[PDB]
Design a protein around this ligand. Structure first.
Ligand SMILES: *[C@@H]1O[C@H](CO)[C@@H](O[C@@H]2O[C@H](CO)[C@@H](O)[C@H](O)[C@H]2NC(C)=O)[C@H](O)[C@H]1NC(C)=O
Ligand SMILES: *[C@@H]1O[C@H](CO)[C@@H](O[C@@H]2O[C@H](CO)[C@@H](O)[C@H](O)[C@H]2NC(C)=O)[C@H](O)[C@H]1NC(C)=O
Ligand SMILES: *[C@@H]1O[C@H](CO)[C@@H](O[C@@H]2O[C@H](CO)[C@@H](O)[C@H](O)[C@H]2NC(C)=O)[C@H](O)[C@H]1NC(C)=O
Ligand SMILES: *[C@@H]1O[C@H](CO)[C@@H](O[C@@H]2O[C@H](CO)[C@@H](O)[C@H](O)[C@H]2NC(C)=O)[C@H](O)[C@H]1NC(C)=O
Ligand SMILES: *[C@@H]1O[C@H](CO)[C@@H](O[C@@H]2O[C@H](CO)[C@@H](O)[C@H](O)[C@H]2NC(C)=O)[C@H](O)[C@H]1NC(C)=O
Ligand SMILES: *[C@@H]1O[C@H](CO)[C@@H](O)[C@H](O)[C@H]1NC(C)=O
Ligand SMILES: *[C@@H]1O[C@H](CO)[C@@H](O)[C@H](O)[C@H]1NC(C)=O
Ligand SMILES: *[C@@H]1O[C@H](CO)[C@@H](O)[C@H](O)[C@H]1NC(C)=O
Ligand SMILES: *[C@@H]1O[C@H](CO)[C@@H](O)[C@H](O)[C@H]1NC(C)=O
Ligand SMILES: *[C@@H]1O[C@H](CO)[C@@H](O)[C@H](O)[C@H]1NC(C)=O
Ligand SMILES: *[C@@H]1O[C@H](CO)[C@@H](O)[C@H](O)[C@H]1NC(C)=O
Ligand SMILES: *[C@@H]1O[C@H](CO)[C@@H](O)[C@H](O)[C@H]1NC(C)=O
Lengths: 262, 428, 330, 98, 49, 49, 49, 49
């Protein structure tokens, strides 16, 4: 299913690698505007075995990056797909994680859906034809358990491809108690940066379809309500004025293009 | 120094500012990362299958000591022009990451690849951004990339739907619409193959011979630096003024173990002056605080030159219990330092005074200093004395509810009020 | 200092700036003139007296209570309760007290020279002329102080504005009570008002903002690859660095020119205000002023100035005709 | 212009000319402020003439120190000098008043 | 307004000018001070009652 | 920007922009002095009132 | 648009420029300082030998 | 007037200049930054082969 929500104030990272304290520095970049539209998405898959077929996967546009937020039990969401034109006519991205590993490729992948027959590989591409770049190492996401589901982890990702150097800004905020995107402010820091060289305007995600649960089905659309537990938001070039805490973190930042007061 | 800073052999009473004093560095410390594995540059430069321009091969450089002087024998080097980073002292820089892109182009377009260049290749096959830092190597490869029949191994695009952003690839085999006429893989008339033959012949003259080009892209933006030049790392010193060269960032100042909390992806720090305040030692991952030398202004308090040749130096806003006394040859810029800094020391809120002693008496003060202190020439037998300014003659009245004071005689006094009313009119 | 603010400890950049001519000796002369001008402003405003007077050991003025304006020995700065209140009200930024984070940041040669008259002798000047004006009236503004009783001086001040002595000598208790109430409530007004010392606060804040903008101007590429001379001189080559550094310098020099040009105009304004305050002292403090609506509103009686951060505050005592009644005249 | 050639002489002349023009701008800007100051002083001197010279001034400590009697101005190079004649109560004696 | 008076609706020129630092926020502050100063002049001269 | 290419267009723009910015600086500097004079005259008029 | 074509020696291929003085640039073909347009130069040793 | 004559490689023919750093320009022949005069360079492959 699909539903809408209000991003409130969220999606602010450190543009630069310079340490600041009690500084009101401002900077302009692909920032998620405050109080914007963030769209839920859900992959209903409880009757997949009883025929039916999922039939629930769109091609999310990527224009000027994508903001990502989700709450998975352990590893429900593993990776993403970027690129354009889908077919081997043009390249694509295959960011995907496993255990303590990440493998990403810029190879001309032709596919149709996003499964991997795991909870393995394949099912998400059929062309290792003219691959250009490969990457490995530590995964973006480190799971931490509070011994219960009340402390739902929130995994805030911001993706950018300005002249390569893929942005994987990530942070863990397990203080959530059930409310969707709770009121408050958090900073956001990168992990890895590497150019890929590709015109990206398509975006998709990977779900652990071989064993899925809690996927209600309905006809919710056009600003309706529906449980999806998976967030996507688009960035636009925005000037941001950031307050750096005396310790060095970010306490609060104000947009420069939303309200006259801002 | 006063007679020099104001061009006159005669100096009258007053306090004059001359220059500052800086503690000179003792030694230079370099902390380039402890790498030795020379990254492969020969494999990039001297190859036999240089990719075509339309599909430029991009090569990543990782932790390495790259000496940009052993590559001069790797290529003919027809042109080694470079951008903001200059190849002269390029071995003294530390890069976050270095990228080399290698391809082949024609002679007339060897200068076409550049920031903000518009044409066929620079717009449709390889575009460099305006803010691009790094530089392009170009040399003729006519002797190798020549075919008597035809060198049909290189390609370049000609037709695209729109322009191209910088630093990406448009490697694709589709059919150009070239109008509303629809075509489906036919590649017939009105729909031309975007890649067309790029054959090379040895008989071609200059401007058409193949020009194998490798362009190095740098990102020296202040960030964790890896690729670095062959500069020997020295021992680290704290609490002493040195000329640090941390990852290509030079400067002067004292370095203290800092209480900063640089996040693992943070390397350099910034105050509200847009200058580096804290740095991370790359060979130790320890955070260092950068504070400049114990500088300060210097003011010379002197009477009229035809009253004496003795002056009193007052340093601006600096306690005379640390640096003003600290002095050595080639350690402080003011070499007039023959002043003892141990005789006649007057600590003042405006910075300490050297050359004058405190007098408990208070008189009308001639040469202003600040914080209620003025120095003046007094006969002991002549020396400069700094005292507290006398506000005025102490006086008391005899206020009484029933008493009154009344004058019985008067004095007529005539004063002068000098008031300028005009200046020298001028025209230029 | 142009050398440090323009080319931080760089020999080649100092050599590059030396060719610019006497383009910063003039800059130093301008700011030295501004500094000596500020010292002259303060001394001209406050040092209107030749001798320092002391208040009598007893404090009786015919019911008049000057406790809030006369200095108290209990406080360690020897300032009046209202004078100290003015100091507390003005959040001073810097005063040059051997600082060795905004002010500490300025390792860029931007130093604040402390004023010649510290705020322990300006208070002495204020107390001296207060004793003069409350024990001798205007007589100490002409020659030697003529000791006269305060009720007599007040009746003389009333005679100055056409009220005659009998009014004061028949209403002295009422006048003393009214004066004490006004002196009591002026401190409360100053304390509880949102911002009354707006002029002094703006005077401090304008200089603070000018210095902050000068500091922030140190990073403007001005058409250069970077705004750091050390990185430019580690990256480029001397000939290419020459123009690049010079371009960054001419930009920085123009930025400093803007600061000194604004400071010249601000100092001219402050000198105009200081001349106004000096005339105000000489007229209102050292005698009665017949100028209407000059020393406060209403008919003027006298004034008491109070030491204030980078300024002076007058306490104009004025006669207001209050409630009135209609009559028939010919 | 004898050494260089027009192509690069132009930009050299442009750099020299903008530097010299900014130098002249600085002089003119300082002259404007100095002339504003001199006009303030001239207005003060004109008021001083009108008040002290053309009559007695009751303003205290305006026309000299002490009670003012009259003044005599004297021409000075680029200025005016006043000779304020003032009454000073001189020596005094204490008394008893009621 | 520095942006319009200096780079008429040109994005690249606005980006070039942005690097010049706080070199026109100060310019705006000076003229805003002049405007409020003119208002204060008029009100101080006339609103004596 | 229609004729030149970014590399030299930028420096040309930089030269034009610094010239125009200094021209605006001159106007603002003159306005500051003129406003100081007008404030002096307004103070004189207020005292006169 | 006006195109002028001729042949010159190698050492003087850069001599044809606004404000250049020498033999050809002063006696045979002089370009004005304010000249707008540009010069195309290529070797023709294979044909003109 | 002083003339200095030597021979160098092609990739370093532009290396001799005021403030250039490398092998020859730093270890064999360095020209000062304030150097006035100019350098003449031509290929001598036909003779020095
Ligand atoms: C995560 O998945 C990747 C494939 O998506 C796998 O990568 C293997 O890593 C091991 C590590 O030594 C190699 O020996 C294999 O050859 C890799 N396989 C492939 C297909 O490349 C592996 O399952 C995980 N990655 C790891 C463990 O690094
Ligand atoms: C993508 O991979 C395919 C795999 O076959 C390549 O297809 C052929 O590659 C050979 C290379 O020697 C060419 O001679 C053929 O013309 C290709 N056949 C086609 C394109 O139908 C293909 O070349 C690869 N593409 C790129 C850009 O490398
Ligand atoms: C490229 O690398 C090869 C090594 O694969 C080297 O080839 C040498 O070239 C020189 C010059 O002709 C010969 O004298 C050597 O005998 C060659 N060695 C080998 C092992 O082939 C050399 O570094 C480079 N060659 C070219 C032609 O650029
Ligand atoms: C593009 O160009 C290089 C150099 O021609 C190609 O060569 C290989 O690059 C990889 C690194 O990815 C090396 O490990 C190999 O040793 C190189 N040679 C061969 C024969 O594989 C390579 O295809 C591209 N390099 C990239 C993408 O980095
Ligand atoms: C990435 O590739 C897609 C391929 O569809 C481009 O989309 C086309 O762009 C051209 C040029 O603007 C136009 O014909 C249309 O906007 C798109 N065509 C179709 C058929 O949809 C897209 O522009 C590319 N991205 C970039 C940044 O160039
Ligand atoms: C979000 O989108 C829905 C429909 O797409 C619209 O009704 C709603 O007003 C939007 N809200 C915001 C804050 O943009
Ligand atoms: C900030 O620093 C102080 C002292 O270093 C510390 O007590 C406090 O916990 C820190 N706050 C954080 C880390 O959020
Ligand atoms: C080398 O540097 C690394 C950090 O990158 C660290 O192991 C240590 O500081 C150095 N080790 C040795 C053996 O020099
Ligand atoms: C300087 O002083 C000496 C003695 O005090 C005197 O003889 C001489 O004329 C003076 N010179 C000047 C220029 O004042
Ligand atoms: C000054 O006063 C105190 C004690 O009265 C002390 O510093 C010193 O003894 C005095 N010095 C002189 C020269 O009287
Ligand atoms: C004035 O009267 C008060 C109250 O009686 C007394 O304390 C004070 O000493 C008197 N002053 C003189 C000197 O007459
Ligand atoms: C300067 O000296 C005084 C007197 O010892 C001391 O109190 C003050 O702290 C010193 N300044 C600094 C910055 O420590």
């Amino acid at each position: 299913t699909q539903s809408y929500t209000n991003s409130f104030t969220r999606g602010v990272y450190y543009p630069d690698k310079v340490f600041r304290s009690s500084v009101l520095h401002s900077t302009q970049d692909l920032f998620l505007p405050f109080f914007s539209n963030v769209t839920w998405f859900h992959a209903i898959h409880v009757s997949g075995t009883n025929g039916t077929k999922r039939f629930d996967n769109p091609v999310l546009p990527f224009n000027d990056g994508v903001y990502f937020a989700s709450t998975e039990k352990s590893n429900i969401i593993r990776g993403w797909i970027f690129g354009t034109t889908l077919d081997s006519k043009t390249q694509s991205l295959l960011i995907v994680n496993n255990a303590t590993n990440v493998v990403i490729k810029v190879c001309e992948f032709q596919f149709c859906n996003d499964p991997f027959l795991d909870v393995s590989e394949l099912r998400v591409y059929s062309s290792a034809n003219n691959c250009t770049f490969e990457y490995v190492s530590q995964p973006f996401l480190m799971d931490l358990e509070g011994k219960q589901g009340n402390f739902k982890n929130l995994r805030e990702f911001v993706f950018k491809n300005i002249d390569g150097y893929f942005k994987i800004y990530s942070k863990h905020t397990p203080v959530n108690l059930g409310r969707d995107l709770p009121q408050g402010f958090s900073a956001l820091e990168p992990l890895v940066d590497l150019p890929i060289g590709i015109n990206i305007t398509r975006f998709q995600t990977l779900l652990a379809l071989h064993r899925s649960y809690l996927t209600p089905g309905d006809s919710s659309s056009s600003w309706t309500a529906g449980a999806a537990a998976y967030y996507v938001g688009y960035l636009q070039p925005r000037t941001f004025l950031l307050k750096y805490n005396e310790n060095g973190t970010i306490t609060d930042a104000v947009d420069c293009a939303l309200d006259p007061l801002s | 120094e006063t007679k020099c800073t104001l061009k006159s052999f005669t100096v009258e009473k007053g306090i004059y500012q001359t220059s500052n004093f800086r503690v000179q560095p003792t030694e230079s410390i370099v902390r380039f990362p402890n790498i030795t594995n020379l990254c492969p540059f020969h494999e990039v430069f001297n190859a036999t299958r240089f990719a075509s321009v339309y599909a430029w091969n991009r090569t990543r450089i990782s932790n390495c000591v790259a000496d940009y002087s052993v590559l001069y024998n790797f290529a003919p080097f027809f042109a080694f022009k470079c951008y903001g980073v200059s190849p002269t002292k390029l071995n003294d820089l530390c890069f976050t990451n270095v990228y080399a892109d290698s391809f082949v182009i024609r002679g007339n377009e060897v200068s076409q690849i550049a920031p903000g260049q518009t044409g066929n290749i620079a717009d449709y096959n390889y575009k460099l951004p305006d803010d691009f830092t790094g530089c392009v190597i170009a040399w003729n490869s006519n002797k190798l990339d020549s075919k008597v029949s035809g060198n049909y191994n290189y390609l370049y695009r000609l037709f695209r739907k729109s322009k191209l952003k910088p630093f990406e690839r448009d490697i694709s085999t589709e059919i150009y619409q070239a109008g509303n006429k629809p075509c489906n893989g036919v590649a017939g008339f009105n729909c031309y193959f975007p890649l067309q033959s790029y054959g090379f012949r040895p008989t071609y003259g200059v401007g058409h011979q193949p020009y194998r080009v490798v362009v190095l892209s740098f990102e020296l933006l202040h960030a964790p630096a890896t690729v670095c030049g062959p500069k020997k790392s020295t021992n680290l010193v704290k609490n002493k003024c040195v000329n640090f060269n941390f990852n290509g960032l030079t400067g002067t100042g004292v370095l203290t173990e800092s209480n900063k909390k640089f996040l693992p992806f943070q390397q350099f720090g910034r105050d509200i002056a847009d200058t580096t305040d804290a740095v991370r030692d790359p060979q130790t991952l320890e955070i260092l605080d950068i504070t400049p030398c114990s500088f300060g202004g210097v003011s010379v308090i002197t009477p009229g030159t035809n009253t004496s040749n003795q002056v009193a130096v007052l340093y601006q806003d600096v306690n005379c219990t640390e640096v003003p006394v600290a002095i050595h040859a080639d350690q402080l810029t003011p070499t007039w330092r023959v002043y003892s800094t141990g005789s006649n020391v007057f600590q003042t809120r405006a910075g300490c005074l050297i050359g004058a002693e405190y007098v408990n008496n208070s008189y009308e003060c001639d040469i202003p200093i600040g914080a209620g202190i003025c120095a003046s020439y007094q006969t002991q037998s002549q020396s400069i004395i700094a005292y507290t300014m006398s506000l005025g003659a102490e006086n008391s009245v005899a206020y009484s509810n029933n008493s009154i004071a009344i004058p019985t005689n008067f004095t007529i006094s005539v004063t002068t009020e000098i008031l300028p009313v005009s200046m020298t009119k001028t025209s230029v | 200092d142009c050398t440090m603010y323009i080319c931080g400890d760089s020999t080649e950049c100092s050599n590059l700036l030396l060719q610019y001519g006497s383009f910063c000796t003039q800059l130093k002369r301008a700011l030295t003139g501004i500094a000596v001008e500020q010292d002259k402003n303060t001394q001209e405003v406050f040092a209107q007296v030749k001798q320092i007077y002391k208040t009598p050991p007893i404090k009786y003025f015919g019911g008049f209570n000057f406790s809030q304006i006369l200095p108290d020995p209990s406080k360690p700065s020897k300032r009046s309760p209202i004078e100290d209140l003015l100091f507390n009200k003005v959040t001073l930024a810097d005063a040059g007290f051997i600082k060795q984070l905004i002010c500490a940041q300025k390792f860029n040669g931007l130093t604040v020279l402390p004023p010649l008259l510290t705020d322990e002798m300006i208070a002495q000047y204020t107390s001296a002329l207060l004793a003069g004006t409350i024990t001798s009236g205007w007589t100490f503004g002409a020659g030697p102080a003529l000791q006269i009783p305060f009720p007599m001086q007040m009746a003389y001040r009333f005679n100055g504005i056409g009220v005659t002595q009998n009014v004061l000598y028949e209403n002295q208790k009422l006048i003393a009570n009214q004066f004490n109430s006004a002196i009591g409530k002026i401190q409360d007004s100053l304390s509880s008002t949102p911002s009354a010392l707006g002029k002094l606060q703006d005077v401090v804040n304008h200089n603070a903002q000018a210095l902050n903008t000068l500091v922030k101007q140190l990073s403007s590429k001005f058409g250069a690859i970077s705004s750091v001379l050390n990185d430019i001189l580690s990256r480029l080559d001397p000939p290419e660095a020459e123009v690049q550094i010079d371009r960054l310098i001419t930009g920085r020099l123009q930025s400093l020119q803007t600061y000194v040009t604004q400071q010249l105009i601000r100092a001219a304004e402050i000198r105009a205000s200081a001349n106004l305050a000096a005339t105000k002292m000489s007229e209102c403090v050292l005698g009665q002023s017949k100028r209407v609506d000059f020393c406060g509103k209403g008919y003027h009686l006298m004034s008491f100035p109070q030491s204030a951060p980078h300024g002076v505050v007058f306490l104009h005592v004025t006669y207001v005709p209050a409630q009135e009644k209609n009559f028939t005249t010919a």
